[PDB]
Structures are given as C-alpha cells and as structure tokens.
Amino acid sequence: EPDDAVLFVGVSLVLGIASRHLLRGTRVPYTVALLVLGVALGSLEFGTKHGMGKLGAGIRIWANINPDLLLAVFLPALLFESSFSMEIHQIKKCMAQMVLLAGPGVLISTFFLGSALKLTFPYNWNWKTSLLLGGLLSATDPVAVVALLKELGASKKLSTIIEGESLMNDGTAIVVYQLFYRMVLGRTFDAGSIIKFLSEVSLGAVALGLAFGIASVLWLGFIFNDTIIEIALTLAVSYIAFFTAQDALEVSGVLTVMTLGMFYAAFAKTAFKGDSQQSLHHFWEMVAYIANTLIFILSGVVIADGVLENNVHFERHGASWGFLLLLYVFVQISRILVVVILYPLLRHFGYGLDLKEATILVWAGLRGAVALSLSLSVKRASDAVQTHLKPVDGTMFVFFTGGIVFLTLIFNGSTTQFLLHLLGMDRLAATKLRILNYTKYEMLNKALEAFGDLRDDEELGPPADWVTVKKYITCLNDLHTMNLRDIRVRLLNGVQAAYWGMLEEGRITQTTANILMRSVDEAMDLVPTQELCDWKGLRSNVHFPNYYRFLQMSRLPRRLITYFTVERLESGCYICAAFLRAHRIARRQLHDFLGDSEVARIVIDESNAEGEEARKFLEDVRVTFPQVLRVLKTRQVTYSVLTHLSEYIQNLQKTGLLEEKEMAHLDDALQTDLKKFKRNPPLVKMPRVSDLLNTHPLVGALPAAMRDPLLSSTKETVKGHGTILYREGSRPTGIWLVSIGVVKWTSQRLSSRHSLDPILSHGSTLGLYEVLIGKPYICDMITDSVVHCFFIEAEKIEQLRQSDPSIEIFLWQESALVVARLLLPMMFEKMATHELRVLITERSTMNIYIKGEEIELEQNFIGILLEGFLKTKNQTLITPPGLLLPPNADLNLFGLESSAINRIDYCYTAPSYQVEARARILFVEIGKEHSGLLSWPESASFSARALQLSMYGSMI
C-alpha cells in the first residue's frame, strides 16, 4: 500500500500544471484553485463512505504526515529559491527599511493580531495559543509576492522593498512562532529565559548558515566543469543545514536556509559556472514549484479531514464563518497599523516612501505556503495525545490560517493591480517609449537582413515575399524645436547606447552593466528640472576604499594586502572607467548630431562638469596604489578573451566536426581556465623600463641595430597631473614617447571648437613633426594624469633619419598621425588607434613633389602639406602645417569654419597649387552598433610592425 503515496504526488503535480495553465493571464492566482482542489479531494476521501480507491489510500498516507518531517522536507525547498534568486546590491542599499518591517513590523503585527484574538474570539484560548496563531499570520510568502510583482509592473524600488520585506519577515515570524510554540508545550519562561532563547535561536541560525555557506563555497571552488555536482552540492548542503539546525542544535532552520541562500547569491559568479547558472535556477524553481503544489494540495486535504472529523467548524454555526472574516479584517488593520506607525521612519531611510508606494505596500500582504506549513505542523502535533494542545484547537488553526491564505490571495492579490493602476502608477514614462520603439526598429532591421541574406537558392527556389513572411512573425506586428530638456535626454540615450556597446563587446560584465543602466534610468527622471545627474547612483559604488585605512595599517602577507585592495577598488574603478568612457562617447555623438548649437554646448558642459568626481577618484587610485589599474585592465582583457573563446567552442560542438574526446578536452581546458580565473584572478607584475620602451610602436618597430643608440641615454620619468611637457613656440629640442597615461594638447591658433577631447593616450609620440621640420612647436602639451614618458633629444632623431632611407618614411608616417589628429580634429578624433593608423599609414598616400610641379586636388581628396613651401597665385608663401581642401569643399562639414568664435588660417581652398620648394604632401580619401539610439527619430614593413606593436603588446 505505500506505493499509492507516489501516485498522490504525481497526481498533485498534474493538477498544479492544469491550474497554472488555465489560470494564466487572469489575475487570480492558481494556488487558490490548488487549495480548492485539495479541499475537494480531502472531503471526497474522508466524508464519503466509498471515497476513492488506490488514490484515497495515498491521500490518507499523506494526511498522517509527521509534524516535523513535513517542515524538514518542505521548508528548505520553499525558501532556498527565494533566498538565492535575489539581488544583493539592491537590498544592501535598501537594507535599512527592511530591518524596520522585519523586526518591529512582525512584532507589532504578532502582538496586535494575537491580542485581538484573545479579546474577541470565543474559543476560550489562553494568551499563548492566541499569540501562537498570531505568529502564524505574520509570515508572508516570498513566492506569491514574487509572482505578483512579476505580473504587477510597478517600479523597481517598490518591487525590491516588497520582495525583501517578505523574505526577511519570513525569517523573523518563524522565529517568533518557534518561541511561542515551544512555550505552548509547557516550558516556563522569564525575561532572562526569553532573551537567551531568542538570542540563541536567531544568532545561531545565522552562524550555522554562514559556516555551511563558507564550507560549501570553498568546496565548489574546486569543481571544474560539472554542473550536476554543483546542483547536488547545493541541494545536499541546504538539506543538511536545515536538519542540523532544526533537529540537532534546536535553532531556527528557516534562518539557516535563508542565510545559506544569501551567501550563495553573494558568491554566484565566484563559485558556480556561467553555463550552469540557468540550470541551477531552473532546478531550484522546479523544486519550489513542486513544494508549493504539494503543500497547497496537502493543506486543503488536511483542512477537509479535520473539519469532517470534528464537525464544529462547518455548519455547526455561522460563528466560524464570521470570525474568519473578522480575523481577515484584523490582519488588514494590523498591516495598516504597522505601516502607519513605521511611516515616519520608512520615509527618509534608504529608498523613499510616499503615500503611493506605501499604500501599495500595505495591500501586498499576501499569505502563502509557510503559514500553511506551520498550521499543518501545529495541527499534526495536536492530533497526537497532547494534554496541552487539544485537537479542536489544531483544526481551529488549520482552518483559520488556510481561510486567511485563500481570502488574502483572492482579494489582495487580484486587486493589487487595479489599485496600482488607480493610484496613478503603471504609466510609461514617455522616455522609455523611445527606447522601446528603437528596439523594435533594430529588430525589424535584423529580420530584414536575415531574410535578404537567406533568399538566393538554386535548389529550393525563392521564398514568399517579405510581407507574407512578416505576417507570421508577430514580434514585429506593431510599433529645429529643441529645448534644454530633450537634449539632456538625448545625451543620456547616448550614454545608454555606449553602455550597451561596452557590455556586448565584452568590456564590462553584466552586473556592472546593470548598475550603470539603473543609474542612468534613475537619472533620466530629474532632467526635466535638474541638470544632468548620473553620478548620484554610482557615488555609493565609488566610495574611496575603506581598505586604504588598513593598507596604512600593517597586514603581514602582501598577497592579502595586494589581494584585498584590488577587491574593494575593483568595482569602483570599473564603474568610473565605464562612466567616463560612456560620457566621452555620448558627448562626441551629441556634438555630431545637433551640430554647434548654444543648448548642445551647455549640455556638453554639464556633462564635463559632472564627470569630475569620477575623474578625481581615478586620479587618486593611480598615485596611492600604482599597480591596481594595470592588474584590472589585464583581468578585463583576459576575461574578454576567455568569453570569446568560450562562445567559439560552444558553436563548434553544435556542428559535429570534432569527436567526443577532442571537444571534451577543449571544453575541459576552457572551463578549467575560466574557473581558475574567476576563483584566483591573476596579478600582473610591474613593467620594467627597458620593457616599455620595446612595446612602444616607434621605438619597438625599429631594427635591433640603430635601436641600442636611441634606448641608451633614455631615462623614464613619471610626471604628475598638470605638468607641462613642451610649450608652443619653443625650439624643437625633443620627442616625448608617452607609453602610459594621457597628454592633453592646447593651442592658441588651432581650432579648439570641434575638439571635445584633446588627449593623446599611451603609445604616442609628441613633438616629432616639429623636430623633423626643424621649427617651433605647434601646440602646448600638458600631462592630463600621471604619465610615464621617455625623452630622446633631437640629435638622435636626426641621426636615425640620416641612417636609412626607410627610417625617414617611417618617422614621417609616425608624425602624420599626431599632425592629422591635431589639424583636423572633427574627422580623426572619434577614430580608434587601429583605424586611424591604418587609414593614415596604409590607405593614405605620401608624395614628394619637386620644385615647379603642379598639384590639383581631385574633388574627393583632402591633403596635409607635411613639409615644404607651396605656392599659389596671390598666396605665394604657405607654411608647412597646412590643410588643402577641394576648391568647392564645404568647410562646415570638416570644421575649419572661419568665424568670430574660432579663427582658421591653416586651411586653403584654391583652384590649383604650384610647388615653390621641394614639397611633401599627404593625401587622404574622403566620401558603431546601437549608436543610433541618441538621434533615432531624425535618422615586414616598419608600418606593419608598428601596427602590430600598437594592437597587441608585442610583435606576433
């Protein structure tokens, strides 16, 4: 006969499925239908003489479940998913408010509801039974409210508040119930006794949870490439922790399971694989679904059993059916009182709480399966021979808690969306409409591209038209007046597009991307009145390391001192770096889109002024801990490489070109590398002087000979912020090889109207064009941050130009880069180093013309007169720093616009030119994903070795 038990479980699941399939889209949850079906099954089995057969025998086997086994089997499953799948950052920033709703809230609710049950209900309960039942009804449901918020559509702050309030409240309400239930059994009490009991239970639960989490994370760290082992470890450790807490030490078990779930959620990236992240969550969601369905089917059956057994709780008199509604009203009043009493505190702590998101927090008081489990446990413990707990009192408890569980879900849970819509919320911001429409546009473009690519076929013929194929896909079924308000939104849209691109290209993880996107989203609401403010959200993540107090303090192993400083500074450095990249890209895109307009310039100035705090924190990390940034960048590049290789290996397995052994070996190696990286990330040594000089394109690409001379008598120098390298006008006495840092260039005669970032990064050569032409410097360069630089005097460069006829052309190709980034900043500033180097050294043509020849720029060619005096009628003398444009070229398209704001005399538009001295000209030819969000509605050879050294660290 025990086999029938299995049947029950099976059958229950089926019912669950049905209830979760038909009652979808409708607002009433399916757990109410589950409870009704359970009551029906229990009544059929226990009331009718024939009842059921081979299934009723499986219901009875379950209706007599042990009071302790029930909890030990069903509570860890119910709680581990809710505790494990929760954002740590959000609650950590909101943890102040949740402490007020967890401790004081549960205390107030428990004592009110229980004091009301003692003074009103007629069952002659003493002051322990009533407050026992009051401790039950103070336990929310982390799954019911999770589903409600899934189908609700409220702001994220309120969602996080409710989702945490419920889980933290569940830990506290279970503790109080444990206390009052132990007291109901007969044990005496006292102030000291109550204090010791509460302290022991509460704190030992968390201690055991943290111990088990630490021991099982330390173990998981060494499990390379096997997901079944990790899932089984989580399961076994959760259940062992619950058994050890609730049944070995006599501490709270729900608290231990919650602490374990949270300790796992905090260390998910470090311990579990990246591909086993969606399988783990799905396994635990399946476990939690089974647990809820089984408990809701079981609780109905047990309620029906008790009712039919005693017969004093149904049709005996309307007393019970009225006192149930009275208890519901009391629960509502208790929640209202808790909220109204903690409002003066919940208003200005963590997140705000105005009348709206406080009237929506009082309604979402859904009861779930934890209260039902506790009621079933109490009823089962009473069904035995217990002088203290009578059987009628146990079924009085199974009846009231299940009755309150049904009325709360049908009324509060169904009318939580109607109320949220009535209050005024649930309306799109009208600034997310643009993002939605742009995403729909980008989806339509992807679909069009795929269709167009897959159309040519000689065998299967052509497909149907594009419209006939779009009618099937319903994912695409339906979709200068500029004020200071809209441009501040276009800039934030550009920032969002930059964040999107950075995460897609692998430059930032998904956690950092989510943090930055949340910051931008919370900032796009204050733009209608306040200036651009995106730095608020990240200011709490960019706290200068509190570790710095302790690096000043002495810790014995430098592994600990270097390891912990690179782990408190790791998130802030990445966030400020990404904030300052996204903002620099957004400024450039906005300048390109809205041209030069007074409002666009003011918004750009707002962004420039906003970036100052991040710039200063980055400057402070560079001087206080010099080796942190290099380690962080190396880790970033290594993680990007590993992610790309992982994506490539996963695509190879689908095809079947490689056998099981070889691909299993490939995958094993890749996963071992990924886990060894995420567990003990590598630390990069410091770079030697003579090493940096060899990674610099100019000095690195030179031959072994004629290089010992340049490197000898070259001393690296570390210059601080604001130091002047060379002033404009002074004679050309050097070239400064910037290998680490940034240098900002300023000029008095060069257009600084279209230059939004006059900075030259590492691997650059400053002052070479000027030492080649032998003339005074054309700009005043000043360091922008800490810069490691080398200075080679002019003589050495002259000797090197005199050495080989091919190290004269190399020097010129290397100086043309800086000359073109300086003269024409509107074209050659948005370009990356690789692209500009390719276009200026490979696809650009450097010609030398003898005296007398004629130069006629074809309409498509712009040219920079690198060297030599060129002549033209009425304009005989022309200085070498110079730009030759097509006679009819539109300046406004290249900058150079001669205006009162910026004077331009280094550009020439003439019919033809005639060489006056031996000239050297450079001719260049003229006429990225998600960047359209901003303005959507309106729209070998030395050169190859240098390019290698500039792309990769060393020549390959």
Site for ligand 46E, rule CB under 6 A: 2, 5-6, 9, 61-62, 64-66, 69, 73, 77, 287, 290-291
DSSP 352: B
CB of 633 to a second copy, least distance (A): 4
CB of 450 to a second copy, least distance (A): 4
Q: Judged by CB under 8 A, does residue 390 bind a second copy?
A: no
Structure tokens at 600: 């666009």
Cα 922–chain centre separation: 46
Nearest to 538 by CA among 569, 511, 576: 576
Could you tell me which residues come within 8 angstroms of residue 703 by beta carbon, excluding any fewer than 6 positions away? Answer: none
Element spanning 384, H or E? none
State the DSSP string of 296-336. HHHHHHHHHHHHHHH-SSSSS-THHHHHHHHHHHHHHHHHH
CB of 22 to ligand 46E, least distance (A): 23
Between CA 560 and CA 568, with CA 565 as vertex, the angle to 5 degrees is 120
Q: Please give the single-letter amino acid code of residue 70.
A: L
Structure tokens at 547: 């570790």
Q: Judged by CB under 8 A, does residue 722 bind a second copy?
A: no
Q: Which is nearer to ligand 46E, 79 or 258 (CB)?
A: 79
Q: Which is nearer to a second copy, 13 or 423 (CB)?
A: 13
Interface of this chain with a second copy, residues 883 to 922, rule: CB under 8 A: none
Question: 814 contacts which partner out of ligand 46E, a second copy, none, CB within 5 to 8 A by kind?
Answer: none
Alpha helices (runs of H) in 429-569, residue ranges in sequence order:
433-453, 466-470, 484-504, 510-523, 535-539, 547-552, 558-568
Q: Judged by CB under 8 A, does residue 182 bind a second copy?
A: no
Neighbours of 50 (CB within 10 A): 7
Structure tokens at 126: 């003493």
DSSP 413: I
**Terminal-residue alpha carbon distance, the chain:** 74
Question: 291 contacts which partner out of ligand 46E, a second copy, none, CB within 5 to 8 A by kind?
Answer: ligand 46E
Cα 556–chain centre separation: 35
Question: 61 contacts which partner out of a second copy, ligand 46E, none, CB within 5 to 8 A by kind?
Answer: ligand 46E
- Binder to a second copy among 695, 751, 755, 783 (CB under 8 A)? 695
Q: Judged by CB under 8 A, does residue 11 bind a second copy?
A: yes
Residue showing tokens 């849209």? 493
Residue showing tokens 């992240």? 277
Q: Judged by CB under 8 A, does residue 513 bind a second copy?
A: yes
- In this chain, which stretch among 280-288, 317-325, 775-783, 917-925 interacts with a second copy, using CB under 8 A? 280-288
Task: List beta partners, residue 908.
Answer: 884
CB of 414 to a second copy, least distance (A): 18
Angle, nearest 10°, between helix axes 319-346 and 88-120?
A: 140
Q: Which is nearer to ligand 46E, 141 or 829 (CB)?
A: 141
Neighbours of 441 (CB within 10 A): 16
Interface of this chain with a second copy, residues 760 to 779, rule: CB under 8 A: 761-763
Question: 848 contacts which partner out of ligand 46E, a second copy, none, CB within 5 to 8 A by kind?
Answer: none
Cα 379–chain centre separation: 46
- In this chain, which stretch among 312-320, 515-523, 771-779, 813-821 interacts with a second copy, using CB under 8 A? 515-523
Q: Judged by CB under 8 A, does residue 859 bind a second copy?
A: no
Interface of this chain with a second copy, residues 634 to 663, rule: CB under 8 A: 634, 636-638, 640-642, 644-645, 648-649, 651-652, 654-662
Nearest to 106 by CA among 412, 416, 334, 373: 334
Q: Which is nearer to a second copy, 327 or 420 (CB)?
A: 420
| String of contacts with a second copy for each residue 431-450, x by CB under 8 A | -x--xx--x--xx--xxxxx
CB of 36 to ligand 46E, least distance (A): 22
Q: Judged by CB under 8 A, does residue 34 bind a second copy?
A: no
- In this chain, which stretch among 417-425, 555-563, 794-802, 946-954 interacts with a second copy, using CB under 8 A? 946-954
Interface of this chain with a second copy, residues 522 to 581, rule: CB under 8 A: 573, 576-577, 580-581
Task: Determine the Cα–Cα distance for residues 876 and 882; give it in Å rounded to an integer.
Answer: 14
Nearest to 379 by CA among 394, 361, 358, 400: 394
CB of 265 to a second copy, least distance (A): 18
CB of 661 to a second copy, least distance (A): 4
Question: 474 contacts which partner out of ligand 46E, a second copy, none, CB within 5 to 8 A by kind?
Answer: a second copy
Whose CB is nearest to ligand 46E?
A: 5
Size of the site for a second copy (CB under 8 A): 158
CB of 85 to ligand 46E, least distance (A): 17
| HSE (side-chain half, CA atoms, 13 Å) at 504 | 10
